[PDB]
Swiss-Prot record:
HAMAP family: SecA. The gene is secA. ATP binds at residues 79, 97-101, 536. Keywords: ATP-binding, Cell inner membrane, Cell membrane, Cytoplasm, Membrane, Nucleotide-binding, Protein transport, Translocase, Translocation, Transport. It is an enzyme of class 7 (translocase). This is Protein translocase subunit SecA. Belongs to the SecA family. InterPro entries: Helicase_ATP-bd, Helicase_C-like, P-loop_NTPase, SecA, SecA_CS, SecA_DEAD, SecA_motor_DEAD, SecA_preprotein_X-link_dom. PROSITE patterns: SECA, SECA_MOTOR_DEAD. It comes from the Bacteria. Its EC number is 7.4.2.8.
Amino acid sequence: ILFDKNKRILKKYAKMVSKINQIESDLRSKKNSELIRLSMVLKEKVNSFEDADEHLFEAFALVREAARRTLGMRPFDVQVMGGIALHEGKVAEMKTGEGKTLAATMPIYLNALIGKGVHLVTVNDYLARRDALWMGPVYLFLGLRVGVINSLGKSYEVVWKNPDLARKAIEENWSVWPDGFNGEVLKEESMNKEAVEAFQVELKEITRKEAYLCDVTYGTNNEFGFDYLRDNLVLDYNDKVQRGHFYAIVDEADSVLIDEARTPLIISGPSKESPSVYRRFAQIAKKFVKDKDFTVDEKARTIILTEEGVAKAEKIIGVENLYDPGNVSLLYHLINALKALHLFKKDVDYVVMNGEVIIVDEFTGRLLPGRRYSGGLHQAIEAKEGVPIKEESITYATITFQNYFRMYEKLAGMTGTAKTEESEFVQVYGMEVVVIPTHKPMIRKDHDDLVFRTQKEKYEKIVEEIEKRYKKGQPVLVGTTSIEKSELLSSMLKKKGIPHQVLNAKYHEKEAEIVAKAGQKGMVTIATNMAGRGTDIKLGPGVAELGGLCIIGTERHESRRIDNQLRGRAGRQGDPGESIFFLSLEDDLLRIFGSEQIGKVMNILKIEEGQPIQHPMLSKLIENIQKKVEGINFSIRKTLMEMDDVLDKQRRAVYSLRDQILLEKDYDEYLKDIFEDVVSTRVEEFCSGKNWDIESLKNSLSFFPAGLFDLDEKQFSSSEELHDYLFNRLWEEYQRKKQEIGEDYRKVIRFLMLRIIDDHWRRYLEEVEHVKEAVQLRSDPIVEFKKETYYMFDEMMRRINDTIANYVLRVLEH
Ligand SMILES: Nc1ncnc2c1ncn2[C@@H]1O[C@H](COP(=O)(O)OP(=O)(O)O)[C@@H](O)[C@H]1O
Ligand SMILES: [Mg+2]
């Protein structure tokens, strides 16, 4: 960093806004018909990022006009500035209440013209619907289709409430905003009510695919990521719903890209297996005779059913062929139960303390309570031990939000709180942060921090402060970091007789309705973890006079971003307001750094028991403490990211393979490769160089059915002759099965391949998660984790290929 980047950039944005301001005169004279015709022309002229830059001024001024006429809202110059930052793939830092929702319409429109889709990401289903409907008239007016995706499979399109009336309003030159009103903001009285009615919108349901084929798609960070994961769980390539990752704008950018991104996105579902089927197979397993019905490979830790074993299995269960596609779960259950019984031993690999099965960690020799074996093996052991079988979700797929959002050709974000952790946006996502000036002077009184010796006196004083403000009539919004802390404060206020509401960040539409009233005289609101996030809190009558909304932070976070989010809920659009952060020496933050030092100063200065210390220099120290904790946490999380990214490259390889399988008509070439890999790895291992261990080779191939290889009385002239024999037998039997089964064999094979690969990938994820924890607790861990994953991944592929080879030869046999 060799210069003041932010100033440099704004200098350019100011000139651009000036040019956009100049265009306004012209467009404002236009009729709605002409503006739509201009939209059509821009459509034809913009087919790439290069074209968009050429027509940005026109596009931005056009959206501003559409918004004025359909919403009665004219984007302020600073919203236009934020829109440019977004178009340039940066994070626009616009404070709370600056109108980010409307600022994004401009780059969304411009880039949507390219015709490849645009994703507007926000943080919950309520906000995605809200912003799509709120901004909808602008997009529809200009001829764009707007999709919305929500959880539970709900997909919508924004459409006019009355298309005929909307059509009339457009063809006739209607505007919510009357001609000759040259203000920045429209008084409510001045709104043309017929235009407001005409330009109303609503949601109609559409398919998820269609939501992605709209020109802009509104959704949540979860739903966009889930759709990509589900696209890689499909059984037919044509069932994928996304169409690339072209441009995404992430609203609440730090919440999504840093905070929510601390944990991976995971797709899971109910196992739908009765515990009774596990106990049944525990019983079935006991009837199997070792070295007659099966053999145990103690090195590979595997169970292999013999001919007589699968015959016994089929008779007991009872099916015609244990390896038929509909029987995959039954085979799985039998192997699990035999494995639990013969490869897992009580007081060695696990223990049964008090009705529960507990791992004996092989990495430390210590117990890992509550943590479970992969792939339902835990249930099998529980069933083996006759203890309660605990329910499990099935994890189908995973990706980090970092890796999801890095797929986009262009990425942008907007939030009020980004600059303090700009290097995270730069290093992780390649986006710098542009601090956009506020529309109005920011006059919120951000008081110096109060630090108490204990949490007990802190909370007592928090309640005293609330009582004081309530009696004055000045509304208070109190932020906490946990539902626990909220309900404790609520109890204390209830004892003082102070009416109030508690918002716990669970019911987003209802909490939005409630928090919208938080700025009215006498209101007291406790909001857990920014409950009601994104809803504007307007000040009620008489409130500005009392000093506006008073924000109380009941502690400070490890990231000042999150503190700044809370304080930003007051003082919006130049309103008066206040914030106060309360801390104690017993708080999490100060227990990390500073409790001791600050405690010494309090005693030196003879701060009274129950009283706080407060000083600009203390506020600075606290801010510096947060800088330090942020820097350390960022370092640690980046190490975790590096490990996730190793696993992500493997994921991309597996998904790529999966897609090719879905796209393949004929599996001849793939099975040649598989059979080659199955034979060659074993021939090189036992029969290359000096070695000639046909016995081990034979055992290594023992998972295959009898009747495939006869290695006992053959005398091969070379490893090549041996290789060719083994390959040819596999190939001959594959070709025979094509003839016996007919052309549906290909579909069967595709089904088995997908299942085998998905199953191995699911269980591999569960195991590398263990290694991830193991390496990061033996605390560079990147190198060690890399090599360990390689080994496991390599073995996974060995096992996938053997399993496919074996399954395709056994399936549908008579
Ligand atoms: N250009 C504008 N003219 C008039 N009102 C606006 C304008 N832009 C935003 N608003 C209003 O400002 C408030 C905050 O907008 P919002 O998009 O929720 O802000 P943010 O997402 O930046 O917190 C809302 O009440 C919205 O109606
Ligand atoms: Mg917002």
